[PDB]
Amino acid sequence: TDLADKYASGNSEISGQELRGLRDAIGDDASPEDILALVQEKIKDPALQSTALDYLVQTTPPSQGKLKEALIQARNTHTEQFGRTAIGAKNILFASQEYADQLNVSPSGLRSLYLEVTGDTHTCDQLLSMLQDRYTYQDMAIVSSFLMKGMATGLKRQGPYVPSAQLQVLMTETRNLQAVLTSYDYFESRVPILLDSLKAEGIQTPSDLNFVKVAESYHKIINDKFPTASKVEREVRNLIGDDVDSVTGVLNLFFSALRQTSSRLFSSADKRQQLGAMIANALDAVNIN
Amino acid sequence: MSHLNYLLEKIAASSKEDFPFPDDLESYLEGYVPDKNIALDTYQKIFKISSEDLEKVYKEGYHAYLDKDYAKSITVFRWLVFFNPFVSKFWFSLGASLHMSEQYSQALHAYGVTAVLRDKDPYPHYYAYICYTLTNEHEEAEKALEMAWVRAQHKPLYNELKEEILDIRK
Ligand code: NA
């Protein structure tokens, strides 16, 4: 219809009514300062503020030449003041809205996270620790995909804020995160099944035992570049105790994980194969021969 | 679109990962000797890839090899070895491609694995001999030559090779 509606049509965080309302509040004789003040007042999120400013500059007719000049200056000052907080967030606006629709998080919450993640160097582990406090594990998969989608967008634009080489490393680390998540996803499902099984035969398991603990042990074992049956057995015993059926159950779970978790988890085919062997060896040592 | 790319996209799509594979298959396969006695499913099995699918990919890599595009063939064969490292012709074609690319150190490894998977064949050992010769010389060439010799003699299938080894030794 009109220009305000076109801006707002695919944008779930603003309406044409709200854009026109901002436009109608700004007089012909408004200064850049006056403009910015009204923008912060009516629009809370910097990305939407930046979007509204684009609209104001574009919709202002020839008769209001002085206003248009003031708006252009005002938008420039806004971009200078907020920087990536405005422009970077705005460039992932629609992505953030589509992904937030699948979560119990706000689109702005996702944009804040993206800015934080890509705003500095981050390893796989640092990304994990970051997500662990903020999200459930099942939500982390979607969140990780949002991060990848945003960074893929950042590679095309080749912006001034975050260098290309950094995005490449960030995407690599995030891919590693997604691989790590497969383990947590796997154990979250299977561990309660093991616990119910052990309970069904009257075997008590440690109260401090959960799928997160098991997943961390799994990764500790995988990240051991020289696996032995002894070390694997000891790790399992520290995890669930000394009951033979309990130890065996975890070992079988670890072995099954080798074909159910991401191939990216293993830096070499040799160690994956060797780890399979050592778990198999640990199972034999544990059971009564 | 190559069938290999079709498979990778098919697998990637059905996962919760953008790219559920190692970034560097060269590094991933280094020093790897597939052990048939380890009770682990191959990734072909895990990803439910049919043997017909892998064969299509093999021809793609083989076609690239015949076009002297060794770089492309090496890429393909590594993926095949990643999916099913117990197929000896995958390693052999990988070795040949590395050989033609003058990447002898890695060519030697691929030939060595081929030998393990295919004990009766003298040819993986013979091409190992050639490569060991090309390093001028690790002195592993003669040991590999003898291994080819043992497997080559007495059998009519490997007579052409038996003649050559005799011709070499003089
Ligand atoms: Na809207």
Residue numbers in the entry:
A (entry chain A): 94 to 382
B (entry chain D): 1 to 170
What does the report in the manuscript say about this coordinate set?
The interface formed by this interaction results from burial of 980 Å2 of surface area. This interaction includes three tyrosines, one of which, Y43 is oriented to allow a π-cation interaction.
The type three secretion (T3S) apparatus is a conserved molecular machine that forms a protein-conducting channel from the bacterial cytosol to the target cell cytosol. Our understanding of how the T3SS switches from translocator to effector secretion is limited, but in multiple systems this process is known to involve a conserved gatekeeper protein. This study presents the structure of a molecular complex that physically links one class of early substrates, components of the secretion pore termed translocators, to a gatekeeper protein, a protein that has been implicated in the secretion hierarchy.
